[PDB]
Amino acid sequence: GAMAITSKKIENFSDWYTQVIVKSELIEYYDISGCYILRPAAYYIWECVQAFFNKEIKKLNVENSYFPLFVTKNKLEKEKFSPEVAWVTKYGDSNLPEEIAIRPTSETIMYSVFPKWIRSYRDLPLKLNQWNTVVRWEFKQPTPFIRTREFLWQEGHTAHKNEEEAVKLVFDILDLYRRWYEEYLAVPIIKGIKSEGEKFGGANFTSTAEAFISENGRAIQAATSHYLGTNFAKMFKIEFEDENEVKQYVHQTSWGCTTRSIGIMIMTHGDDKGLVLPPNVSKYKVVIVPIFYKTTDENAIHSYCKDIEKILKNAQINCVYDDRASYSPGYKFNHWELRGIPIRIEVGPKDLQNNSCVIVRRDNNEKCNVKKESVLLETQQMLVDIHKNLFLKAKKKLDDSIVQVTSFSEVMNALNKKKMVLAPWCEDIATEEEIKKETQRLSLNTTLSGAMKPLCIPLDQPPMPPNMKCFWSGKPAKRWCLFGRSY
Amino acid sequence: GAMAITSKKIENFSDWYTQVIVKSELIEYYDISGCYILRPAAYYIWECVQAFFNKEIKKLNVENSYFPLFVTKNKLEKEKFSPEVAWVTKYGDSNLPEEIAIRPTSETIMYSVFPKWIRSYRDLPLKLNQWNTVVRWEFKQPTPFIRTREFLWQEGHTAHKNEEEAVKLVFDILDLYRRWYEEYLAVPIIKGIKSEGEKFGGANFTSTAEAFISENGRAIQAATSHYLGTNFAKMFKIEFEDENEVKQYVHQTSWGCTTRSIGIMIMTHGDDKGLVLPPNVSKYKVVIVPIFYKTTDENAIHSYCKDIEKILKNAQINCVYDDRASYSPGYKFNHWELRGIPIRIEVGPKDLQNNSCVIVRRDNNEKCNVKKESVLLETQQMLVDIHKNLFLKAKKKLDDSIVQVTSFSEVMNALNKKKMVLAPWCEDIATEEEIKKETQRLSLNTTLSGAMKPLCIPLDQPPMPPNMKCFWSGKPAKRWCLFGRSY
Ligand SMILES: Cc1cc(N2CC[C@@](C#N)(C3CC3)C2=O)cc(NC(=O)Cc2ccccc2)n1
Ligand SMILES: Cc1cc(N2CC[C@@](C#N)(C3CC3)C2=O)cc(NC(=O)Cc2ccccc2)n1
Ligand code: PRO
Ligand code: PRO
């Protein structure tokens, strides 16, 4: 009975995951499949990254707005997601006069009105962002945080007078996403360009951040930044009069990150005692647990712990003193380890008379004795050191998951050691499907598809030797590409 | 042509309103009726009040969460909004296996899972809040901000071990709503209790803040705080084991405020030059406009204005220097008056050599000469004074809209001078419909209904004389009640 996780992360990944997100109180399941309740501990992470991203995109002059949840068939025909689109058809027990659709993304909704806001070069750039939810009602297997039917995200859309400005903003955003994942979630990502078979519909190109879950060998797209060029401008007639009084199409970007980031964080840092949180996204940085070794007095210990609590709160470090008289210290240790609190301070009589206390890190369980008036400083530093540790332990694990190959015969082996492969590729779009269908075929060897897809063409390219040929088709290769199984 | 408003507020209210919200760039209309785009200037107000409310409800230990947008028929039967509920019935061109509903409110969605979170008195109180959007797909006439089919709001839900705690939280929330409207929107409200015909379905009682628009004589409900008692607990089986090991029902509250607050603010402070913003919800507190009286040099004036801009930004007062070479100073004055900026600073050559500048308040258009090194301080104070002025001018207008009456014969007259009436009332629910139907009948005398409804029973009650009888039914009266036309 007790608590904790009954599956080990390295042995039954999927069940370890569902156990962790339910018992850490991040998530509640719901009676519609693919929909989940975000309880306060998870919503707090989202609020944290929201504050960071809002502050960074105000420096780029992006402004927040809110657009409607619904779109008409009329405006949806200008883009001619068709099966992922949910249709509202009645109110109460009577039918609507015209059925309407719930947004899977806000391109058509927003660009239906862009033309009245953009008429001349004086109106550019236009830079909008929304924090909202979208609905993609697919019938594949959902995964909490990772792939859901309704999810929270941010979506930004910009319009510029030329291509250079737009592309610069695309890559500025992509580095903001790098920081979102590193400075707050302590998660390393790889920047790259999607192949033509995988880019956003209507984009000129799609840039992307990719993460990897090494325990089950799967890549996950972490965020995207599309250069749309003038494609949507042509569809929606977003013209402006330039400084030579010539009509031009705007050059557009759109970009998005979702609550999938939370999932990625859990899958990277979680362990067999459960959740591990980077301090910057944990509401409580410290939990103080008292220990009464049948002590002659509770109240010296109560007094001491609340002294430590006010030391910590005066310096704006939010913490909690678990003084519940009903539970034992061991119960409390596990209760807060499962909920991911980064630092635990224990005081017993032994520590009280040495004017000391025990500090325990949640990441490596290393315990340290520290004098009372030293605790604040040693807490601050150690919070910092926890982040770096999490990050670098994840960074190493990312680096050691990429096997460089030059022929298809090396590929299946690497996939079955739970790796991605970096391979020379001709980038012809037909080969994408072929590679998918062959890797799946040779996967006869755990609920998700064995196909390997192109994940991204890394921005950091290794040199392409002179006559190096494509690992799949034998044609002359153009670039190095990442392939792997994904979510 | 030019710009501005072609209708005066006191003569064609509804058209003045639509002109103001479109031309101040608060709102864009959409091709689905009753749905509106919140452009950045309006969304900024919402973000402001969001920050205030988040900080205040964290002091009450309310925690933010996110629940799904959809509910099943199954969970919707436990509450047996039926016509306001939109039904999703297909994805793409295929039908869903079971149709699902979009939330008009989250009671049934959240309380379907409350029972697994509340099992014992140790689990109470439970305090949740959501920032989200809801859909009420009615076929009455929509009004931007005021009554829409999709709107943004906050909804809080709490569960307590007894009635006293729950009721205390109800009225704590109601005073937070009072502060939201006063300290940020500079809008006075009246606190009261809804009559039994107007309270939330399933509530024990509904407390409410009401506002009044004196230019067209209409009350608007500004926010609500419901004491649900154990009604929803009985429906959803939210039981807990108390400290005497007896099974008890939780006592619940729910409470909400929407973007209707923005509308109320516009209707209170707007004038014939357009929008008037309280500084605390304006992104730009100050706009600096340069004036070149055919000056021998632009650049002394450019230098001076940017000096003033850095004085203002160093002290964290966000402002904008309108240096567009194309437009005249008069154009710029109207451009920023229409957009509601509270303070305008003008510099011409005359002012530059006196080392002075002109400060103009947006509320009363009063202009004042001020020395350069004095500007910061005189800006700060004047921002403050603008708020109080707006508030008290609105407060007076609220007070002078209530006529106290004792018989029905006085009522129609007061309604036609655009007043509310405070009347002695027996509070029998039947009379509600009767009073509605009679006032509408006698309204033959501008697109909205002439019926007068009970708005609220004020918390601030005048004394009820000994044998005072109900103004409608002649029965002995119980309390004083506000009645009027509403939105
Ligand atoms: C939670 C989450 C996230 C995301 N996506 C999309 C790509 C992206 C990135 N990068 C967004 C564009 C920015 C991302 O995170 C997508 C999703 N659901 C789905 O696709 C639908 C679905 C539902 C159930 C099963 C299978 C599929 N669910
Ligand atoms: C913008 C906004 C606000 C609010 N409501 C509700 C009461 C409340 C208060 N207090 C909320 C509970 C807190 C409020 O603000 C309600 C609405 N639409 C509607 O009723 C539906 C509708 C749509 C078109 C025409 C006529 C009616 N639209
Ligand atoms: O869904 C996507 O991938 C793009 C980026 C956000 C809006 N549309
Ligand atoms: O809609 C209402 O009036 C209540 C308060 C927020 C949730 N339900």
Examine the domain organization and report whether A274 and A285 are in the same domain: no
Provide Rg for chain B, Cα atoms: 26
Q: Exposed, middle or buried by CB within 10 Å (0-12, 13-18, 19+), for B239? A: middle
Nearest CA in chain B to A326: B122
Distance (Å, rounded) from C-alpha A480 to C-alpha A458? 7
Examine the domain organization and report whether B369 and B433 are in the same domain: no
Q: Spell out the SS3 assignment of chain B.
A: CCCCCCCCCCCCHHHHHHHHHHHCCCEEECCCCCCEEECHHHHHHHHHHHHHHHHHHHHCCCEECECCCEEEHHHHHCCCCHHHCEEEEEECCEEEEEEEEECCCCHHHHHCCHHHHCCEHHHCCEEEEEEEEEECCCCCCCECCCECCEEEEEEEEEEECCHHHHHHHHHHHHHHHHHHHHHHCCCCCEEEECCCCCCCCCCCEEEEEEEEECCCCEEEEEEEEEEEECHHHHHHCCEEECCCCCEEECEEEEEEEECHHHHHHHHHHCECCECCCCHHHCCCCEEEEECCCCCCCCHHHHHHHHHHHHHHHHCCCCEEECCCCCCCHHHHHHHHHHCCCCEEEEECHHHHHCCEEEEEECCCCCEEEEEHHHHHHHHHHHHHHHHHHHHHHHHHHHHCCEEECCCHHHHHHHHHCCCEEEEEECCCHHHHHHHHHHHHHCCCCCCCCCCCEEEEEECCCCCCCCCCECCCCCCECCEEEEEECEC
In a domain, A261, yes or no: yes
Examine the domain organization and report whether B380 and B479 are in the same domain: no
Determine contact: B92 vs chain A, CB below 8 A: yes
Determine contact: B47 vs chain A, CB below 8 A: yes
CB A203 within 8 A of CB A179: no
Boundary residue ending a domain (A257, A278, A299): A278
Examine the domain organization and report whether B323 and B462 are in the same domain: no
CATH code of A445's domain: 3.30.110.30
Q: Report which bound ligand comes closest to the CA of A141.
A: 1
Examine the domain organization and report whether B309 and B379 are in the same domain: yes
Q: How many domains are there within chain B?
A: 3
Examine the domain organization and report whether B114 and B231 are in the same domain: yes
| Contact: A44, B28; criterion CB under 8 Å | no
Nearest CA in chain B to A102: B88
Examine the domain organization and report whether A226 and A260 are in the same domain: yes
In a domain, A301, yes or no: yes
Picking from A62, A71, A74, A91 by the largest number of B CB atoms within 10 A of its own CB, the best residue to mutate is: A91
Q: Exposed, middle or buried by CB within 10 Å (0-12, 13-18, 19+), for B463? A: exposed
Q: Is A180 in the pocket of ligand 3 (CB under 6 A)?
A: no
Question: Which is nearest to B293 in space by CA: B348, B333, B353?
Answer: B348
Beta bridge partners of A397: none
Q: Exposed, middle or buried by CB within 10 Å (0-12, 13-18, 19+), for A18? A: middle
**Which domain does B433 fall in, by range?**
402-486
Q: How far is the CA of B155 from the centre of ligand 2 (A)?
A: 13
In a domain, B395, yes or no: no
Question: What is the number of residues in chain B?
Answer: 487
CB B194 within 8 A of CB B208: yes
Q: How far is the CA of B18 from the centre of ligand 2 (A)?
A: 18
In a domain, B86, yes or no: yes
Examine the domain organization and report whether A88 and A181 are in the same domain: yes
CA-to-CA separations, B205 to B111, B225, B237, B485, in angstroms, rounded: 19, 9, 20, 22
Distance (Å, rounded) from C-alpha B392 to C-alpha A301? 54
Distance (Å, rounded) from C-alpha B39 to C-alpha B27? 6
First to last CA, chain A: 32
Examine the domain organization and report whether A100 and A195 are in the same domain: yes
Contacts of B152 in chain A (CB under 8 A): 66
In a domain, B103, yes or no: yes
Provide Rg for chain A, Cα atoms: 26
Give residues 126 to 145 of B whose Cβ lies within 8 Å of A.
Answer: 128, 132-133, 135, 137
In a domain, A330, yes or no: yes
Q: How far is CA A8 from the centre of its chain?
A: 23
- Residue B273: what are its φ and ψ, rounded to 5°? -80, -5
Examine the domain organization and report whether B74 and B221 are in the same domain: yes
User: What tokens does B292 get?
Assistant: 């070149």
CATH code of A376's domain: 3.40.50.800
In a domain, B393, yes or no: no
Neighbouring residues of A441: CB distance < 8 A, sequence distance ≥ 6: none
Question: Which is nearest to B206 in space by CA: B181, B238, B231?
Answer: B231
Boundary residue ending a domain (B224, B257, B278): B278
In a domain, A63, yes or no: yes
CATH code of A194's domain: 3.30.930.10
Question: Which is nearest to B472 in space by CA: B414, B444, B432?
Answer: B432
- Experimental technique behind these coordinates: X-ray
Question: Which is nearest to B438 in space by CA: B388, B487, B473, B477?
Answer: B473
Boundary residue ending a domain (A278, A296, A327): A278
Examine the domain organization and report whether A161 and A298 are in the same domain: no
Q: How far is CA A44 from the centre of its chain?
A: 14
CA-to-CA separations, B264 to B147, B209, B453, in angstroms, rounded: 11, 12, 19
CB A319 within 8 A of CB A287: yes
Beta bridge partners of A289: A346
Question: Which is nearest to A108 in space by CA: A158, A140, A146, A70?
Answer: A70
First to last CA, chain B: 32
Question: Which is nearest to B222 in space by CA: B196, B192, B252, B183?
Answer: B192
Q: Report which bound ligand comes closest to the CA of A106.
A: 3
Atom of ligand 1 at shortest range from CA of A258: 15
Examine the domain organization and report whether A181 and A133 are in the same domain: yes
